Tab-separated table of C-alpha atoms in Angstrom:
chain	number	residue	atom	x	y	z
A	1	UNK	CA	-21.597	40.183	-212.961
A	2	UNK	CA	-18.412	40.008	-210.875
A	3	UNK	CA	-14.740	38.301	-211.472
A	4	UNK	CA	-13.519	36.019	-209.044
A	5	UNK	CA	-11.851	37.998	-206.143
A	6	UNK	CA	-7.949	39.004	-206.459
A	7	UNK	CA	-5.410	38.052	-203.635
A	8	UNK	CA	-2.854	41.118	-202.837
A	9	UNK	CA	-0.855	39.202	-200.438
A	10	UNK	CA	0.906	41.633	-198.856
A	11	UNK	CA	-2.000	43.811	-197.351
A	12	UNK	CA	-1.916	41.504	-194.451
A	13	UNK	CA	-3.754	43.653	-191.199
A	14	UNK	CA	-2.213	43.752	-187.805
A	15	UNK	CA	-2.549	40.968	-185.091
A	16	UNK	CA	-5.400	43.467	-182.936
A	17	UNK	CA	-8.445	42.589	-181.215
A	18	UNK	CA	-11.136	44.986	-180.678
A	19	UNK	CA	-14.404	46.062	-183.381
A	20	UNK	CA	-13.374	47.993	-186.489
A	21	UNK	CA	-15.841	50.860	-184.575
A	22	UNK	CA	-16.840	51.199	-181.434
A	23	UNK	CA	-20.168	48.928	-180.533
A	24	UNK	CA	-22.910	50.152	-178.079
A	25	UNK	CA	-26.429	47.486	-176.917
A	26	UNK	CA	-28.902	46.938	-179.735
A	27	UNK	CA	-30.777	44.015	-178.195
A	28	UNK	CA	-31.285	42.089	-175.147
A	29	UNK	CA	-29.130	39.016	-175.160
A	30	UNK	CA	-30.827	35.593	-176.244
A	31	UNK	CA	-30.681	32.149	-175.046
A	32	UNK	CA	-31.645	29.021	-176.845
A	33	UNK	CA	-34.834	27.087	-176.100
A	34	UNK	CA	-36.107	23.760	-177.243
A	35	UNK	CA	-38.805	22.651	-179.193
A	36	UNK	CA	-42.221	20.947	-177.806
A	37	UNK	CA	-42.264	17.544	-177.427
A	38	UNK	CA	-38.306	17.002	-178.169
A	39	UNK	CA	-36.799	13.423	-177.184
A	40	UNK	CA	-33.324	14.321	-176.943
A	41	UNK	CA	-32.080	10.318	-175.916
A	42	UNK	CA	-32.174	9.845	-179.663
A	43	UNK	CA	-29.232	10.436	-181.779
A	44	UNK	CA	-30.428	13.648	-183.931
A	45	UNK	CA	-30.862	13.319	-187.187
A	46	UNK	CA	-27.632	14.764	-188.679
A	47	UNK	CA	-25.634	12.467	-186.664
A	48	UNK	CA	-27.473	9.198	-188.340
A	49	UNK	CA	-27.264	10.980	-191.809
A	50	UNK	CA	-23.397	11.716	-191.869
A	51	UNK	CA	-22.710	8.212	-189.760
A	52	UNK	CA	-20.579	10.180	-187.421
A	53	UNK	CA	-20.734	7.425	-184.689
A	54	UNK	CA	-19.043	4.946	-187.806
A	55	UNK	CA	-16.682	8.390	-188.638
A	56	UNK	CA	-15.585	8.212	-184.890
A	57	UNK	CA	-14.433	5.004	-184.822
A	58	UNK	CA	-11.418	6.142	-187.265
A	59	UNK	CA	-10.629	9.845	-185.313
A	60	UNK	CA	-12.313	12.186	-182.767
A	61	UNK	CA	-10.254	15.131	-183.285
A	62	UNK	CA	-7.564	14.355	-180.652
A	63	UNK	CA	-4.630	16.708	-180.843
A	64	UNK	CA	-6.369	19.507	-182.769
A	65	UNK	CA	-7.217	22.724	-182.343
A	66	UNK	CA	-10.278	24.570	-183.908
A	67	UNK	CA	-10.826	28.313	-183.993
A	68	UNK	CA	-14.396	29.248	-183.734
A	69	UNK	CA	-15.398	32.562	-185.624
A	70	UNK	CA	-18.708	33.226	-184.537
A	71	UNK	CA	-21.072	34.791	-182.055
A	72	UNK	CA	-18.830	34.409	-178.570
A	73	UNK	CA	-19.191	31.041	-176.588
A	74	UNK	CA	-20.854	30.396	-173.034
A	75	UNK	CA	-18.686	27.898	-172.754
A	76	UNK	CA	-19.495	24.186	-170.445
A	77	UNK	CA	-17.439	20.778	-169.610
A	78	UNK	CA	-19.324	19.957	-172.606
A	79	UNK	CA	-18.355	22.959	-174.739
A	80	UNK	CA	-15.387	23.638	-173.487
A	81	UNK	CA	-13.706	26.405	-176.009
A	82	UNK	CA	-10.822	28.335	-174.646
A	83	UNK	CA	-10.398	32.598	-174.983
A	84	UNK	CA	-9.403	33.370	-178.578
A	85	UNK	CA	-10.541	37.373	-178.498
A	86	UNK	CA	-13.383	39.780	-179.046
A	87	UNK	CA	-13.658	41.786	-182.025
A	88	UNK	CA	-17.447	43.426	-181.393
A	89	UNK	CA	-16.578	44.637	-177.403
A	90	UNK	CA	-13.343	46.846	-176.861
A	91	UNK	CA	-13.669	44.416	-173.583
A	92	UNK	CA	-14.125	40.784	-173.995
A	93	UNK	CA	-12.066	37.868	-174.553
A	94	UNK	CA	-14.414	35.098	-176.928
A	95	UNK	CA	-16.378	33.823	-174.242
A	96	UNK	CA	-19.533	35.866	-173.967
A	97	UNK	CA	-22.079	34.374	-176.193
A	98	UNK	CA	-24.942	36.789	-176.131
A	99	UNK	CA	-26.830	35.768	-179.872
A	100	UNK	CA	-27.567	31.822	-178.755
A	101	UNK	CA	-25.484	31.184	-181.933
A	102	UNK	CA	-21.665	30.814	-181.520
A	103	UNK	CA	-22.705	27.984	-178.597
A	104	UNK	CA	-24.509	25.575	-180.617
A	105	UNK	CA	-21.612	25.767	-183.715
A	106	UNK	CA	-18.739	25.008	-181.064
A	107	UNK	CA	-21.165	22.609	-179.967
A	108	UNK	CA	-21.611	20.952	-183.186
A	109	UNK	CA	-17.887	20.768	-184.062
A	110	UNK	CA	-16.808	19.684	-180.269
A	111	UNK	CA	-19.394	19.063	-178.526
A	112	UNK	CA	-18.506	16.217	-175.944
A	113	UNK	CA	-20.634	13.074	-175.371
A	114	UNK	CA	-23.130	12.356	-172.241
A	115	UNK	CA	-24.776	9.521	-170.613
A	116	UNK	CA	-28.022	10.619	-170.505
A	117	UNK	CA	-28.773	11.851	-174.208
A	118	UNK	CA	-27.703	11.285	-177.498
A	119	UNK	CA	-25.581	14.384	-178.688
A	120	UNK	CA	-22.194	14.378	-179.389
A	121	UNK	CA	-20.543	16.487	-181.719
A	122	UNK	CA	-18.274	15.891	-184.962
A	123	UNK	CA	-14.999	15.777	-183.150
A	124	UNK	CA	-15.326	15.476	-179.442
A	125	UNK	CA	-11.404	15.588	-178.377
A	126	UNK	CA	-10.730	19.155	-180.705
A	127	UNK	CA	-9.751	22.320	-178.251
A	128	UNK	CA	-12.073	24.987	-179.148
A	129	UNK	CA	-10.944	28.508	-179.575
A	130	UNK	CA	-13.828	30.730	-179.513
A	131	UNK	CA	-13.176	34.411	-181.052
A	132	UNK	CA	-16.838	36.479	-181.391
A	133	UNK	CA	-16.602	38.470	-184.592
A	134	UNK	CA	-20.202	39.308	-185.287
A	135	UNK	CA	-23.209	39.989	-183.264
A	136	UNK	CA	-26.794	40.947	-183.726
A	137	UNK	CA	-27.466	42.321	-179.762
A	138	UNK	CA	-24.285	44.865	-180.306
A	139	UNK	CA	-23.568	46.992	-183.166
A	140	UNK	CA	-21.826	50.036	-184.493
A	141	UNK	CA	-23.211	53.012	-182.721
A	142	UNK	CA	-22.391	56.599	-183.702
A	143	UNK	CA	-23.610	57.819	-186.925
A	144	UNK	CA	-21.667	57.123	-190.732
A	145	UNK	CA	-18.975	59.576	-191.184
A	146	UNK	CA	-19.899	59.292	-195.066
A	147	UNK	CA	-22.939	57.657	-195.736
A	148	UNK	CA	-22.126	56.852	-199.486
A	149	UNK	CA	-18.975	55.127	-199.177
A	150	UNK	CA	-18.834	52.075	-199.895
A	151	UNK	CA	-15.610	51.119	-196.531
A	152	UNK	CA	-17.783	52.831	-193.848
A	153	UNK	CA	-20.630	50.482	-194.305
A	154	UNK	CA	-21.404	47.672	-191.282
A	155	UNK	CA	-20.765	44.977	-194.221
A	156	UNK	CA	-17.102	46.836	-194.758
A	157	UNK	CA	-16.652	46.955	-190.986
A	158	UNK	CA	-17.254	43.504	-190.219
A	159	UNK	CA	-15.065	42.340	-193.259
A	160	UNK	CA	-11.878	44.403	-191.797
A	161	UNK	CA	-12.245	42.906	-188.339
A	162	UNK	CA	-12.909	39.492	-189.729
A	163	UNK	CA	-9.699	39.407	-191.552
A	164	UNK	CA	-7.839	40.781	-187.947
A	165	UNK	CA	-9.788	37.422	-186.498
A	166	UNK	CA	-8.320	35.127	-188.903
A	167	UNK	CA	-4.366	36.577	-188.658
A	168	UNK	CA	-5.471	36.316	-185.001
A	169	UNK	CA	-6.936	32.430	-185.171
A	170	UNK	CA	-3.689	31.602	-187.184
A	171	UNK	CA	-1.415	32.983	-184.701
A	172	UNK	CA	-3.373	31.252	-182.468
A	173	UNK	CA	-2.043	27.849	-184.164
A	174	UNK	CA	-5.699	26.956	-184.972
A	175	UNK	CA	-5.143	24.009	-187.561
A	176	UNK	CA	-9.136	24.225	-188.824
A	177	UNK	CA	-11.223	27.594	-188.140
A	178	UNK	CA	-14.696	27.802	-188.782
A	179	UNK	CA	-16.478	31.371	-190.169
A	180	UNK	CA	-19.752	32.034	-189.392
A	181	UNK	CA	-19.727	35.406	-190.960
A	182	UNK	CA	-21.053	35.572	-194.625
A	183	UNK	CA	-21.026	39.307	-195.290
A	184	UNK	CA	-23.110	40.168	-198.775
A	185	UNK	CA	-23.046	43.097	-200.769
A	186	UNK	CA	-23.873	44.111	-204.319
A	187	UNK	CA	-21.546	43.842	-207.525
A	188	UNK	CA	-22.390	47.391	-208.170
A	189	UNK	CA	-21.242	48.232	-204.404
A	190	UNK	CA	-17.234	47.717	-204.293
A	191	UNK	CA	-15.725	47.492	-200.646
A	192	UNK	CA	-12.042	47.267	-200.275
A	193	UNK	CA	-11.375	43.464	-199.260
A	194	UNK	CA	-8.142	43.385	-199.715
A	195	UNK	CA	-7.105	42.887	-195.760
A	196	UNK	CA	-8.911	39.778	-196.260
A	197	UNK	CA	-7.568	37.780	-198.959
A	198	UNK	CA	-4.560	38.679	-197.043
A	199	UNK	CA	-5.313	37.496	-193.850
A	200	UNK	CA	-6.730	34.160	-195.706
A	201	UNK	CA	-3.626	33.507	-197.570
A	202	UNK	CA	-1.782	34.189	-194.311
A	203	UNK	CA	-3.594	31.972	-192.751
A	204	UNK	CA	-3.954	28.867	-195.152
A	205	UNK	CA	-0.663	29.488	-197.479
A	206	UNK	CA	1.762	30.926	-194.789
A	207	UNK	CA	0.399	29.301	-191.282
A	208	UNK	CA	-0.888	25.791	-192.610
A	209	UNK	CA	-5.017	26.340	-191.211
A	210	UNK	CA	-8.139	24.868	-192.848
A	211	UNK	CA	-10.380	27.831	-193.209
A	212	UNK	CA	-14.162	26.435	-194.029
A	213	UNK	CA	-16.666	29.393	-194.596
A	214	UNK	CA	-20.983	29.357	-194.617
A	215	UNK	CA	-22.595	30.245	-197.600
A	216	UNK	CA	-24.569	32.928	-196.235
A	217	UNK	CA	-28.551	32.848	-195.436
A	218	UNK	CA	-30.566	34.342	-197.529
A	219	UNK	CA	-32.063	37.523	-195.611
A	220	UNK	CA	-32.316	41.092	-196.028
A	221	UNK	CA	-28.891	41.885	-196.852
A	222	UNK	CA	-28.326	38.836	-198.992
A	223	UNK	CA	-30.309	38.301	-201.924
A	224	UNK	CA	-30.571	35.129	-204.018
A	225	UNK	CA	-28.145	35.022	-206.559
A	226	UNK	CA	-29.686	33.604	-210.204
A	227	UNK	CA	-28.687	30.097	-211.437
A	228	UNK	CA	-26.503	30.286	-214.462
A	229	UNK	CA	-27.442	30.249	-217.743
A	230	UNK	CA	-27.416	27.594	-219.889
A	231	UNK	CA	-26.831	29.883	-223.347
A	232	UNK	CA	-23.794	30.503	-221.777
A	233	UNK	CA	-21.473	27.247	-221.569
A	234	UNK	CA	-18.431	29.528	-221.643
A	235	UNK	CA	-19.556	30.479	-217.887
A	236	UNK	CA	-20.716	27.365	-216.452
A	237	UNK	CA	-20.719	28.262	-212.900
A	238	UNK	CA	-22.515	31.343	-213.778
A	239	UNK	CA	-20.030	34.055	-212.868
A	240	UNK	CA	-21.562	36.612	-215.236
A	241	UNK	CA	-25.042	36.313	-213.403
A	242	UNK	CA	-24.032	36.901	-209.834
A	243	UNK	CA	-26.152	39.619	-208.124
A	244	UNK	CA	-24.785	39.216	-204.483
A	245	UNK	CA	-20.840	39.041	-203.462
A	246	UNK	CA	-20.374	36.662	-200.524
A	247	UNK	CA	-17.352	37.401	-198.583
A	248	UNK	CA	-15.490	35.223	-197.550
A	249	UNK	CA	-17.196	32.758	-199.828
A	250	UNK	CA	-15.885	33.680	-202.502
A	251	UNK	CA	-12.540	33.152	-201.689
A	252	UNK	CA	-13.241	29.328	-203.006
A	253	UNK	CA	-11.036	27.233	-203.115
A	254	UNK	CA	-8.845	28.752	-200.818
A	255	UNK	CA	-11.624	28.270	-198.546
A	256	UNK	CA	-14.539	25.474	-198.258
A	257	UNK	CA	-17.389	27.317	-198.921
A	258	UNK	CA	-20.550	25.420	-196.987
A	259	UNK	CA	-24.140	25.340	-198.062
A	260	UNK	CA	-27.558	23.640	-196.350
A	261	UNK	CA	-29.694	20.428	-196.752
A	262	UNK	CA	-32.824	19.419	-195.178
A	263	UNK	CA	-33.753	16.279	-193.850
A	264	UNK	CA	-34.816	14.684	-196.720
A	265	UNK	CA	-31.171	15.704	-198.463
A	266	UNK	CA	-32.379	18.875	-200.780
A	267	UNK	CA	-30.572	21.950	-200.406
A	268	UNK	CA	-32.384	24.681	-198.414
A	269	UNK	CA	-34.619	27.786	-199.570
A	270	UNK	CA	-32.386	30.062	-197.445
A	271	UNK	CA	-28.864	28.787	-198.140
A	272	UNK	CA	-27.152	31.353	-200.987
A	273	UNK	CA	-25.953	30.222	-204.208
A	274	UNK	CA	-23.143	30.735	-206.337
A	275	UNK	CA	-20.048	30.156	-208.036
A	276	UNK	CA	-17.601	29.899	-204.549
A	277	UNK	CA	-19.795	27.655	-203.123
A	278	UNK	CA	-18.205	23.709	-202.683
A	279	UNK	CA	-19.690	21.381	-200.407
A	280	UNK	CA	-22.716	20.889	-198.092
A	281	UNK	CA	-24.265	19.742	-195.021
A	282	UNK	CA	-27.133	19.273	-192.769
A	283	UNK	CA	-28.569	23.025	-192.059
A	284	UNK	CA	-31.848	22.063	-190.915
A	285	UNK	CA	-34.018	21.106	-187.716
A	286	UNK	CA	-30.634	20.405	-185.824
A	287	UNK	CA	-29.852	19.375	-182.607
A	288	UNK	CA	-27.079	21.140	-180.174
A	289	UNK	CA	-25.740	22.063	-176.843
A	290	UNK	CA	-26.667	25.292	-174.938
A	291	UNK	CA	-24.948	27.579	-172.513
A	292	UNK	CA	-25.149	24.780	-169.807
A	293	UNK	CA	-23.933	21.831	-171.937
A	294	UNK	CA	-27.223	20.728	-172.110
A	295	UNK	CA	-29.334	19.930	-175.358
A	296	UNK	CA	-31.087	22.385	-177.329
A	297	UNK	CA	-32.649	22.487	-181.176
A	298	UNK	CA	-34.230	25.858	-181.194
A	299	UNK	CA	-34.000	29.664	-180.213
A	300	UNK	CA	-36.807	31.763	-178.921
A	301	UNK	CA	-39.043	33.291	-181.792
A	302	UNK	CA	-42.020	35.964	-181.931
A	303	UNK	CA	-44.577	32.879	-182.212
A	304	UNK	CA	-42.578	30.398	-180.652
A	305	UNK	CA	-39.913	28.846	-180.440
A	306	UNK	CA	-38.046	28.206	-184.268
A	307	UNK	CA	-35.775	25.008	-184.666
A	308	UNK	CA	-32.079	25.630	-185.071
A	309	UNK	CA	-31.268	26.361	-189.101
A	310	UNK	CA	-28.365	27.743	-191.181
A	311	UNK	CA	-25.213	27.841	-193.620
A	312	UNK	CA	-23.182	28.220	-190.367
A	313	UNK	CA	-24.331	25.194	-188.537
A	314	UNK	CA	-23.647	23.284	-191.995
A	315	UNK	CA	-20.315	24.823	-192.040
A	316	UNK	CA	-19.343	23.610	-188.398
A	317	UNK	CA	-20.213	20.311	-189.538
A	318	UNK	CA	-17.450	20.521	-192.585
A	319	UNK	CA	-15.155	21.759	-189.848
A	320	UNK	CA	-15.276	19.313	-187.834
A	321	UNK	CA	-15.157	17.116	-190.739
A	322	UNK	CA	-11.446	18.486	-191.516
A	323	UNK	CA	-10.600	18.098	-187.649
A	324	UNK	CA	-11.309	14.476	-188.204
A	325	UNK	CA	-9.136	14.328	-191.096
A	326	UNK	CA	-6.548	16.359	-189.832
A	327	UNK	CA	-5.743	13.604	-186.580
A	328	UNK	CA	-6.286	10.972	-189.079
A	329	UNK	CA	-3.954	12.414	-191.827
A	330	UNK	CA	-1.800	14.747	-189.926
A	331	UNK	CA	0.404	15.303	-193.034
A	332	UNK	CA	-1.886	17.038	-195.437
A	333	UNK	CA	-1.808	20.365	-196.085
A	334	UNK	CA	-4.844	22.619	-196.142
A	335	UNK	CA	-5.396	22.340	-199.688
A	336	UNK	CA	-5.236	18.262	-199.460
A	337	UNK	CA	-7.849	18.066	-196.475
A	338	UNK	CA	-10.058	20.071	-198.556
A	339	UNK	CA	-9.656	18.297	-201.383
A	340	UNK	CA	-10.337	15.068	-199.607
A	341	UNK	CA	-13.772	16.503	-197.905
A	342	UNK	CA	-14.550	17.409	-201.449
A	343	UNK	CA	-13.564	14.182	-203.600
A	344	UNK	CA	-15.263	11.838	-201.446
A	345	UNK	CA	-18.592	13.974	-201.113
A	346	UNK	CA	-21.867	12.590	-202.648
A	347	UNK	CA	-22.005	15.291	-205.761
A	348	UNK	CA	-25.241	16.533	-207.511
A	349	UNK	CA	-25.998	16.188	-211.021
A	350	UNK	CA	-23.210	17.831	-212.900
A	351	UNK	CA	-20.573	17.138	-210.785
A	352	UNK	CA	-20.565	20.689	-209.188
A	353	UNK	CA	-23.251	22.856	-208.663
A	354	UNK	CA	-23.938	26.381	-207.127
A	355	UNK	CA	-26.270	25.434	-204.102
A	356	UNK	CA	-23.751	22.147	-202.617
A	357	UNK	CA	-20.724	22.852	-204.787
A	358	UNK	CA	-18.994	18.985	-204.783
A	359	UNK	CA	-22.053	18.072	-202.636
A	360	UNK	CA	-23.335	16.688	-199.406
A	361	UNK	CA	-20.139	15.461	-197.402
A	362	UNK	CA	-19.454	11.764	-196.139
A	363	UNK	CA	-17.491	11.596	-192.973
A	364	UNK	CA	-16.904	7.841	-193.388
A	365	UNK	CA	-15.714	7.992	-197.085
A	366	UNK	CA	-13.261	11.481	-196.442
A	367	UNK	CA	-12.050	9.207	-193.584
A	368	UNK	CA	-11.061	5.827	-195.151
A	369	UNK	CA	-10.881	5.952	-199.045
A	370	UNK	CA	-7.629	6.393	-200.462
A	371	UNK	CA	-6.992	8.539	-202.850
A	372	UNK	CA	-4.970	11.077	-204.880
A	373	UNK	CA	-3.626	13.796	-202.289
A	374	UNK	CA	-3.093	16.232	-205.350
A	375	UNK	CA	-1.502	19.769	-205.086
A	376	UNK	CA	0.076	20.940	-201.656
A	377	UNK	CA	-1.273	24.495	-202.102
A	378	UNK	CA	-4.400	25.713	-204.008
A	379	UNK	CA	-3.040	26.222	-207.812
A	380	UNK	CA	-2.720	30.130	-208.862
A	381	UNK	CA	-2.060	31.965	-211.556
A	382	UNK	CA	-0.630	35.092	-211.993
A	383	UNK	CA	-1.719	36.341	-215.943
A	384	UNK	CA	-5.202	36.233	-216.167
A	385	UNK	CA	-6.907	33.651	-218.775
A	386	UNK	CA	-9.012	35.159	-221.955
């Protein structure tokens, strides 16, 4: 069991680039591939299923910024993100995209259009900002000063540069920033996060950013969490029966926490579940753009090629999502995009659940219903309730 996270507001970390430790080569760097038999003149299917050639016809993004927190970008005239930092190389700047990852989000929140397929992304007029947070090819090299706490883990690590990214991002004057990281641990395990709820109440309450988060895969690290129990209508959203902290899910609703659906509109084995978690999109079989500009739907695998899945993917959809909102309604706060994205979603059974939160989003809807614009910040309290 677990209480939702604390915000100390004032443990806000410095403005620095650079990896929490230094990084040294763990694998060779990858580059995306495509899948047999692809027919890449047809619109893929995420773009038919979220009507984003309708949704475009209302914004594209024009005017607004997007911070991608991610992998790096190779960027392209396609792709075209702009140096936001490095926080896994002492020496980079954002633009080295060496996990075939970081690419295809920017791609799927910016991507531009072409002539001779049928990709485009959510908002094809945003400026990118890429900043590369995480990486699989380069991690922490020397060995654990203490190998039993808790803030010398990787996990740890990569949550203390990730909050320098978003005070970064912010500065920036990224209006809508994307995080690919979804860094699990267990309740039992406490790491000191308090640098970023900072950072994200920096960055939402003081500078005025969407912040939309993935869910997290489900993996080695992250374990399934259990659905709540029904004995237990005092805990509806099953609080008491989480297993696996998501960070920085679980900063919800100061954040749009993003989980996966297939095809055929299910949510997916892989995406985690939980209490934080608040709206959904397609994570599955996807179509984007590669370190040319060109199309791409799937990353080299050890039998073959495997299509292109994942909470963040489903996450850069939501993003671009609030880019379209934010040219469209450039007077809403953070909180009022978000609850927009959220009202107008197609919710599951229930109203809310733990797998798509408010459910599967609906560019079209966010775009053109009108609505109650409710609170200009997310609600707080201060006393905690009984």
């Amino acid at each position: 069991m677990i209480d939702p996270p604390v915000i100390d507001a004032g443990a806000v970390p410095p403005d620095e680039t650079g990896p929490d430790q230094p990084t040294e080569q763990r694998k060779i760097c990858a580059t995306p591939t495509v899948m047999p038999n692809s027919n890449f003149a047809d619109r893929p299917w995420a773009n038919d299923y979220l009507r984003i050639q309708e949704a475009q016809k209302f914004a594209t993004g024009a005017g607004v910024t997007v911070a991608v927190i991610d992998t790096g970008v190779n960027g392209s005239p396609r792709v075209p993100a702009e140096p936001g930092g490095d926080f896994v190389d002492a020496a980079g700047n954002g633009m080295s995209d060496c996990d075939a990852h970081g690419t295809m989000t920017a791609a799927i929140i910016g991507g531009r259009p072409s002539p001779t397929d049928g990709f485009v992304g959510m908002a094809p007029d945003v400026r990118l900002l890429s900043l590369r947070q995480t990486s699989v090819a380069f991690q922490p090299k020397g060995a654990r000063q203490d190998p039993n706490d808790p803030n010398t883990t990787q996990t740890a690590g990569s949550i203390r540069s990730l909050a320098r990214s978003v005070v970064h991002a912010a500065n920036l004057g990224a209006q809508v920033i994307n995080i690919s990281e979804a860094a699990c641990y267990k309740v039992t395990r406490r790491i000191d996060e308090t640098s970023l709820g900072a950072a994200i109440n920096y960055a939402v309450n003081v500078k005025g950013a969407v912040i939309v988060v993935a869910a997290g895969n489900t993996g080695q690290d992250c374990s399934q969490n259990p659905p709540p129990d029904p004995s237990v209508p005092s805990d509806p959203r099953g609080w008491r029966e989480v297993q696996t902290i998501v960070s920085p899910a679980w900063y919800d609703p100061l954040v749009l926490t993003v989980g996966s659906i297939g095809q055929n509109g299910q949510p997916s084995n892989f995406s985690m579940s939980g209490p934080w978690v608040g709206a959904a999109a397609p994570g599955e079989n996807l179509t984007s753009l590669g370190y040319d500009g060109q199309p791409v739907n799937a990353t080299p695998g050890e039998d073959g090629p495997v299509p292109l899945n994942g909470t963040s993917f489903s996450a850069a959809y939501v993003s671009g999502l609030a880019a379209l909102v934010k040219q469209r309604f450039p007077d809403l706060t953070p909180a009022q995009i978000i609850n927009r994205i959220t009202a107008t979603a197609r919710h599951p059974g229930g109203g809310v659940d733990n797998y798509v939160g408010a459910g599967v989003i609906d560019p079209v809807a966010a775009l053109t219903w009108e609505i109650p614009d409710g609170p200009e910040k997310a609600p707080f309290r201060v006393k905690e309730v009984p």
